[PDB]
Amino acid sequence: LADLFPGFGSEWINTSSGRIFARVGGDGPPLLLLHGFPQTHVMWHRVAPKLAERFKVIVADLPGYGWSDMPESDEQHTPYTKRAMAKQLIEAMEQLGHVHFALAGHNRGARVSYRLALDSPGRLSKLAVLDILPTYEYWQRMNRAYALKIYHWSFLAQPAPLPENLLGGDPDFYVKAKLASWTRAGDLSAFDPRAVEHYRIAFADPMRRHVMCEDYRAGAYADFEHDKIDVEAGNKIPVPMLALWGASGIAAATPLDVWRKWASDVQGAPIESGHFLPEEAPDQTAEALVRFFSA
Amino acid sequence: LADLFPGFGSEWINTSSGRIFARVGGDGPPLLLLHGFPQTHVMWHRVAPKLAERFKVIVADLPGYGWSDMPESDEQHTPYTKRAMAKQLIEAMEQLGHVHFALAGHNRGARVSYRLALDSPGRLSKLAVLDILPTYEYWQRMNRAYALKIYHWSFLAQPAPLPENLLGGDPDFYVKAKLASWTRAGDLSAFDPRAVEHYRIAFADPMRRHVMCEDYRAGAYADFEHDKIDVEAGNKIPVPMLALWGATPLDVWRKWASDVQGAPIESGHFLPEEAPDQTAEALVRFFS
Ligand SMILES: [Ca+2]
Ligand SMILES: [Cl-]
Ligand SMILES: [Cl-]
Ligand SMILES: [Cl-]
Secondary structure (H helix, E strand, O other): OOOOOOOOEEEEEOOOOOOEEEEEEEOOOEEEEEOOOOOOHHHHOOOHHHHOOOOEEEEEOOOOOOOOOOOOOOOOOHHHOHHHHHHHHHHHHHHOOOOOEEEEEEOHHHHHHHHHHHHOHHHEEEEEEEOOOOHHHHHHOOOHHHHHHOOHHHHHOOOOOHHHHHHOOOHHHHHHHHHHHOOOOOOOOOOOHHHHHHHHHHHOOHHHHHHHHHHHHHHHOHHHHHHHHHHHHOOOEOOOEEEEEEOOOOOOOOHHHHHOOOEOOEEEEEEOOOOOHHHHOHHHHHHHHHHHHHO | OOOOOOOOEEEEEOOOOOOEEEEEEOOOOEEEEEOOOOOOHHHHOOOHHHHHOOOEEEEEOOOOOOOOOOOOOOOOOHHHOHHHHHHHHHHHHHHOOOOOEEEEEEOHHHHHHHHHHHHOHHHEEEEEEEOOOOHHHHHHOOOHHHHHHOOHHHHOOOOOOHHHHHHOOOHHHHHHHHHHHOOOOOOOOOOOHHHHHHHHHHHOOHHHHHHHHHHHHHHHOHHHHHHHHHHHHOOOEOOOEEEEEEOOHHHHHHHHEOOEEEEEEOOOOOHHHHOHHHHHHHHHHHHO
16 A cells, blocks of 8 residues: 655554544644545545645544544444544544644544534634535435435445445445546546555455444434534534535535534635545645635 | 245236236236335235135236346336336236226335326226335435435435445345335244245346336336326326325325225235235225
C-alpha cells in the first residue's frame, strides 16, 4: 500500500475506545480531516499537501475504519454512533494537545463532525461538512424516489448478518461499483488507483465490512434519534460552518438552505463534482477549505 | 423434490410468451392460485386439497418462476410487469377453456391478481388477495420506517447487475432468511422442509433470481405508474373481493374496490403455510 502523504508522520493515538490511526503533517493551527464510507484517511491525499502549507493537518481513520481499532459493537451500535465517534476523536485530539481545533468531514466523517459540534461546540473553531445533509434530514425526505436513488442506507442497516453475508461473496465488486457510481462520470477515473487499492483492501476484511454495517445501523436508529432531539428542540450549531456539496453529489432545496435550519452561521457553495469532492475536485476543494479556515 | 399435491395432475400450458407450469386438481368451478416471492406454486400445498373438495384448482408458477418458462425481459421490465403477467395468465387459462374464474393470490401473485381485476374484470367471478396492499400504497407509505422494513423493494430494484451480483455469493442463506424473517415464529418451523427445498432450488438458479429482480424493478417503475393511473382516475375493482392479512388493510382496499370484505388471520406473511386451516376455511367460505 502506497504512502500518499509525502513527509507526513504516522501516529497511532490511544483512546478509551481504541486506537485512532492518523497521518500528521504541516504546521500552524490544528485541522482534523475525517473521511467516510467506503473510504479511509487516504481520500484526503490530493488536498492535504495544500492544507499542510497553512495548517497542522491531522488525517484520521474513523473509529473502526482503515487502521483504527475496531471496538466490539452492541445492540444499539453504540461505538459506531456519531456521538460515540465524536467523543473518541475528541480524546484522540487531547492526546495531541488539541482542545480547540478546526474540522472538516466528508460523508460519515461529516456526520461525526456536525454531531461533535452539537454535543461539544467549544471543541471547534470552525467546521466544514462535505456533500451531506444531517442524518435526520436524509430520513425525513424519504419517499419512493429517494428510496430508489440511494438504497444503501436501508440495506446496510438490515439486522446482521444479512448485509455482511451478501457482501462476502465478491466484496471488491461492491466497493468499486459504489466508488464509481457516486462520481460525476460514473467510473473510477477520478481516483488515484493507489487510493482505490487502500479502499479495496479495507473492504476486503469482513471485520471492517461489519463496522461499516454497524455504522449504517447507527445511522438508521440512534444517530437519527440524536438528531431528532436537536431539531425538535430547535438546537442549532453556533460554530461558523461551511457546507460544500457536489452538483452531482448525494446531498429539492439546496443543501445550504437545509443547513441554515441546523446552524446559525453557515455559508456554502456547490462544486462541479460527484460525491467525492476531495478527489474529483481537489484544487477547488482545497481552495474553499483554506479560504474558509484562514478567514 | 417431493410431490406435495396428491391427486393433482401436472401441466405445461402454452402461451404467446412461454409455458406456464401448473398442478391441476379437483372438479367444479375454476379457481386459479398464484404464489409470490421467494416461493413457487408449492406454497399452496396445505390449502389446495381442501379447495379441490369444491373447485377445479389450478396452481400455477408465475411467468418466469418455478418451472414456468422465462420470457426475455427488456429495459422497462415488461414481461415481469403485473399487467403483462396477468395478460399471460389470461392466455394460459383460455388454453383450458376458462374465461371466467375465481382467483386467489399471495405476495407478487396477489399483485398480478388485483392488476388482472383492474384491467380485465370480466375474467373474474371473485378475487382474494393475501397479505398485501396495492403497489402504489406501499410506495406512498415509503418513509423511514417502511424503507427499513421493506428494504428489498428498493434493493432488488437497483439496476442490474447489483442485486444479482450480491445474491450469487450465498443464495441459500438469503432465501432461507426471507422465508424465516417474515413468519410469526422468525424461523423455518412453519414450513414443510420439502417445500423449503423447492424454494431453495428455484432460488439457486441465477436466471430465476434475475427474473425476481426484474419483478421488483417492474414493482418500482411500470407497475407503480399503472397503479397511479387508476388511483388518479378513481378506478375501483368491481369484482367481489376478499382481503386476508396476517395479524387497516380493509380500509385501504375499500379505496381500491367497491365490494370488498376482509379478515385478519393469526399468522405472519405466509398465510397458507403458517395458518393453513384458517386460510383454507376463509377461502372456501368466500369462493362458495
Ligand atoms: Ca499520552
Ligand atoms: Cl446526506
Ligand atoms: Cl479542482
Ligand atoms: Cl409482495
